């Protein structure tokens, strides 16, 4: 009975929390000295790429409303809050020569101070897709190896300013999603690949993302970890891949390959210092090679790994492009039966067992000693017709969270050392290409009235069932 | 050539301006002591009635941004600005016993003082559809004759507080629209008639609108006009009605009847103290009767009439009770596959600039009004969330529309109509009632992604250059 | 000797405090976003119903003066403070679709934080008669079963915002008084029954009060209590009922019936899930019936019960439909020319300290309540605008009254009643409903001539010295 799941089902030190990212909630896009990111530029120059043509200039205004966010987090009563730092907020020009923005640093310091004053642990991501436009424009951002040193200097700035208080850092969030939607589908900033090349650019970008991560982890471990005694990791996009036919050796291989191309692509490098075999084989000369120094810096470059999980698919065997390199076909149905029901999004199929399976797979395949679920959540059905009191009865979310958290506990019984779980998201917010219509929050946002926060049923259940 | 039309084509004292209404722009819906109106309640409880399910809680935030609106009006350089007072902002419970809200009065004082400090004449409408919910709940708002005294107390409050500076008052804006969409179609607040009765309620509501207007004009004329030396009138909804067949006596009658049911409904009472003949005939016992004292108070109850104009229709004779069916006409958009005019961004707004000339001439001929203002005329942009600001601000359709209509107003003045001024609708993109924010009427663009940032469209710049000073 | 009664006569963890209610003290009636309640409307539209025609617009201004009230509570030195939240201050339109008022929530946060910062426990009542007018107008407030869900949403808002700090909640205060004076005598808001029906409406209103209470307790117990670890109960109006003739079986029955109609009306439902037998018999088909699920939700729906007590009466058997006549009793004040007790400053409050012992013993015996608080007990000063402050603050009658009643509470605890605390009514002289400001219940005197200046009466000083820490 997942409806009964509670903190008593978990070890005493187990961390519960909720999440956000800077571009999705802050707004103040041009306030307090912030410089533009590639998402500012993409949403302003190409509003046809966004449902409703909207953008993050104001978002849900957590830049000015952070005290209310902290007050909501206090009332919610969970242990921790995952948020990201906007790189071009602290460094409007991305590199140190573009200036250091003291007011941007002061904002993160105030947020961190308010969190700690209320017994809430900050889990901080350095990079959640908001590449400074100045770096994008100067040398192509993550297309260039110059991104690695610039990212290290930004990481060092954050460790120096905030590391006395922040003890849990993540270099990157979902580099898979950044790489594939930025450079293969062209659906996300910087909008390339749909001028772009979906067969080459995603592999360069992922290669540089890995090097940025490894270099920032090295910097933290060598230069900060002894004095600040924090931990550093990374968050990866996951989706469970099930063989379409359980008894087809070909489908079992296809599902494993889809896991290689999505998760292994980032996990094998930080495990053995190389890409997955299946990727080396199918991608060939279009897959860059690590030097022996790079491989050594990459191998074991984490204190923990965060996994983000939403959904699952069946998998069968199938101009260069990433999509076709995987050599699989995804399937949603067996004999007319979907792997799970849809959320408010047609791509999000609810399959709670998938999170147990991805956690078991990750421990088995990469032998990760400490794991967090850094994102798990579900979006409401679109319906501008509902009043607040009807909109806040989010019983699909409530069941979703319960079933998934239940499955996390099952993975822990199977032997996975999971140290915490963060719902996505605290607040309804800017859902990238879908704009504001897709609501993931446990807290409702009234976009008609200054982004007023009101807890959904799932928030209240979380507080009552998980508050220490 | 309408593209050449400018201030030099008009008398020295001709007044050019732009407009808004309180619920459409202010926001601050629960800020500064404001009480709810029936539009708060309608948008909150029935968001399915609004495109996108939006509301006026924040609108374009002119409640907090009024200084910026004043600065835009100054840069625009036109003579005047037409806005409305929110009744439930100054009197949150509608009647005096619900309290007088000093902060609400302070807001309108600040707006009026900013306007005057920049050489801009305030044209102020008392009622633009935002009935205090407290009155709606206590006795049914305009369904009740109690509305008349309450509206008089509210009018007197505004004349007392503001009349030393405001010299141009309008009792009501488009009582036609309020009555028909509130009580016949149920599409606007309070959402009745679609519990409601489209055959009876619109006529009671209009009867009380008329009595409120006449009573407030009487109050201004007897109690304020000598000391304050201002003028008071009313703004009416109009649409030009053309016989579908120019040579059909039947279609000529039908167009005239459609004019009687829309404009005569309000104009004949303030002209002769009774409703149009065609209304008495087709509405029968469902049309209320004025007492002789009520007729005397209504007849000549204005110093000026404002007209609002957008579009036109062909009209033919029609083929249980309801206002729409009482008119006994059928509206037609096309003759032989040719529409009366092309669509704006709205499929109901067909661009027919000659219609504003015709409605002016018709109004002067039929009701012999000695001073007229065009209190609204404007057009909405094609819906397109794909455009950047610099593409969105090139409003060529609006620029043409304004030029052609202003040209037509000048033609009406040559025909003998004493038009004293003209007000574009609207200054700002705003809340367009049941269509929400997607329908942009502004000469000033609104960035809804970024704190409602104002930016002048091409039409604003042309207005300043061609009509300033 | 009750004059010697002190903290050392009670258990270490016994809670002493004082009380207020939102409408009686706050003022700021239209400040900080607050929406109207039915008491705003009642006092404004029907000032003849209030002695002196006054109202709660400003009251004693605890809305702005809350820091001073906290400082007084600190100096007073008692453990706890009982206040109510104004429903229409946090939710101006009563239901969520009327908006959530952040400033109203900020006020109660500030008050709670000041209280805790000074070692004072907040005891918080959700509903103390100030029904949002928006709910009253939309569907008749407590006359409608819609009130139950709306009250649940309001309760949940308060638990969410405040429950991390507030660990003692009361759903309702004196629903008896609300029901009887609102709907049987029509003397209190909403002023019905004196359009109303004193034979039916009080029973519907009480039925819905009970369902709102049971539903809000269920919500707290299932959704908040595990994470917040607080307690929730309810406060009931009581008056001691003594047989006029100790040896008349008929008078014994009549007193018990009077107890059934006042206290059993609310207590039996939360005890066994039904109304008292005597009520079912005498009220018949006019008494609503609980469904089996409603009975299950009501039975045991509290962690504690608060009792409010002032006075006592003799009772005898009585000699078209109405609550008052359904009780079938006659109240008597005298035996052989000897009143049950002397009058306070009010002719209805007869001082009978033994009555609080008896109502405690009766409540434990009849309903087997395991934890009881006296949530109100107090007495009003003789009316005399002739006294200077130093004469007015010598409240010997109150000082005696408190001592004798507190002594009686201690006697009830010796008899076996588990009383966990005691709250004087009231902290401050305040708005005493239909009697206005002339009726002073405070242990703290209010100077109504001079910005409601607070000054402790003799009783406040005795309470501090005898019951502090």
């Amino acid at each position: 009975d997942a409806t009964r799941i509670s903190r008593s089902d978990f070890p005493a030190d187990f961390i519960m929390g909720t999440g956000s990212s800077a571009y999705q909630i802050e707004g103040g896009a041009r306030d307090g000295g912030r410089g533009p990111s590639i998402w500012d530029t993409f949403t302003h120059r190409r509003p046809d790429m966004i449902r409703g043509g909207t953008n993050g200039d104001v978002a849900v205004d957590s830049y000015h409303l952070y005290k209310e966010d902290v007050n909501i987090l206090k009332n919610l009563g969970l242990d921790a809050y995952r948020f990201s730092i906007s790189w071009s907020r602290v460094l409007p020009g991305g590199r140190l020569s573009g200036g250091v923005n003291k007011e941007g640093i002061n904002y993160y310091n105030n947020l961190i101070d308010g969190l700690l004053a209320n017994g809430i642990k900050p889990f901080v991501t350095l990079f959640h897709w908001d590449v400074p436009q100045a770096l994008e424009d100067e040398y192509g951002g993550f297309l260039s190896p110059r991104i690695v040193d610039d990212f290290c200097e930004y990481a060092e700035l954050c460790f120096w300013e905030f590391g006395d208080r922040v003890k849990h850092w993540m270099t990157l969030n979902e580099p898979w999603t950044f790489s594939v939607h930025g450079y293969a589908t062209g659906l996300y900033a910087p909008g390339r690949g749909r001028t772009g090349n979906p067969g080459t650019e995603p592999y360069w970008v992922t290669h540089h993302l890995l090097l940025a991560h490894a270099a920032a982890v090295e910097l933290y471990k060598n230069k900060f970890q002894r004095g600040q005694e924090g931990q550093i990791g990374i968050s990866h996009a996951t989706q469970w891949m099930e063989p379409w036919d359980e008894n087809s050796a070909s489908d079992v291989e296809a599902a494993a390959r889809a896991l290689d191309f999505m998760l292994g692509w980032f996990m094998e490098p930080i495990t053995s210092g190389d890409y997955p075999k299946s990727m080396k084989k199918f991608v060939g000369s279009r897959l860059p090679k690590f030097s022996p120094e790079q491989s050594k810096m990459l191998k074991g470059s984490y204190d923990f790994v965060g996994l983000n999980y939403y959904t699952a698919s069946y998998v069968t065997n199938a101009n260069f492009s990433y999509n076709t390199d995987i050599h699989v076909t995804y399937e949603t149905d067996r004999n007319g039966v979907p792997i799970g029901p849809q959320s408010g999004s047609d791509w999000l199929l609810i399959y709670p067992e998938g999170i147990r399976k991805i956690l078991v797979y990750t421990k088995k395949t990469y032998n990760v000693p400490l794991i967090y679920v850094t994102e798990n959540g579900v979006d409401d059905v679109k319906n501008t017709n509902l009043t607040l009191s009807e909109a806040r009865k989010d019983s699909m979310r409530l069941k979703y969270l319960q079933d998934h958290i239940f499955n996390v506990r099952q993975a822990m019984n199977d032997g996975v050392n999971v140290k915490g779980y963060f719902a996505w998201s605290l607040l309804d917010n800017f859902e990238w290409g879908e704009g504001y219509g897709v609501r993931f929050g446990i807290i409702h946002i009234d976009y008609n009235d200054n982004f007023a926060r009101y807890p959904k049923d799932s928030a209240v259940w979380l507080m009552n069932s998980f508050h220490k």
Side-chain angles (χ1 to χ4, degrees), chain A residues 251-293:
Chain A
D251 286 2
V252 164
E253 247 179 73
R257 178 165 67 254
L259 289 162
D260 293 343
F261 268 80
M262 184 176 188
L263 185 62
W265 189 13
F266 296 89
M267 287 301 306
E268 196 60 54
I270 72 178
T271 301
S272 58
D274 210 356
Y275 288 114
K277 253 184 177 205
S278 71
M279 293 198 76
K280 302 212 275 151
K281 156 171 183 181
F282 283 105
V283 187
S285 55
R286 289 174 296 112
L287 192 67
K289 277 93 181 130
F290 295 114
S291 71
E293 300 89 52

Side-chain angles (χ1 to χ4, degrees), chain A residues 141-246:
Chain A
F142 276 91
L143 279 169
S144 160
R146 296 186 45 188
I147 199 68
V148 172
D149 287 342
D150 290 341
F151 183 72
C152 283
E153 259 156 28
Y154 164 56
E156 176 168 18
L157 172 53
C158 300
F159 302 151
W160 174 264
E161 290 293 332
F162 312 123
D164 67 304
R165 281 151 296 135
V166 175
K167 309 304 185 183
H168 301 86
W169 294 100
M170 286 139 297
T171 50
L172 314 175
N173 172 257
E174 299 190 4
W176 177 85
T177 314
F178 181 80
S179 180
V180 166
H181 291 302
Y183 304 83
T185 68
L187 296 170
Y188 281 5
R192 295 170 70 81
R194 211 230 268 122
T195 180
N197 188 325
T200 52
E201 293 193 352
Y203 302 109
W204 283 112
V205 166
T206 282
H207 201 72
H208 297 151
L209 287 160
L210 286 160
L211 294 176
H213 163 261
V217 164
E218 185 188 69
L219 190 133
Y220 187 78
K221 289 197 156 280
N222 293 347
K223 289 183 178 191
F224 288 87
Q225 192 163 45
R226 175 188 185 168
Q228 300 185 340
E229 291 191 316
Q231 280 175 302
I232 191 163
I234 179 160
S235 285
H236 292 305
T238 80
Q239 167 177 348
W240 179 248
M241 303 295 176
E242 184 76 17
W244 197 26
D245 182 336
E246 299 219 330

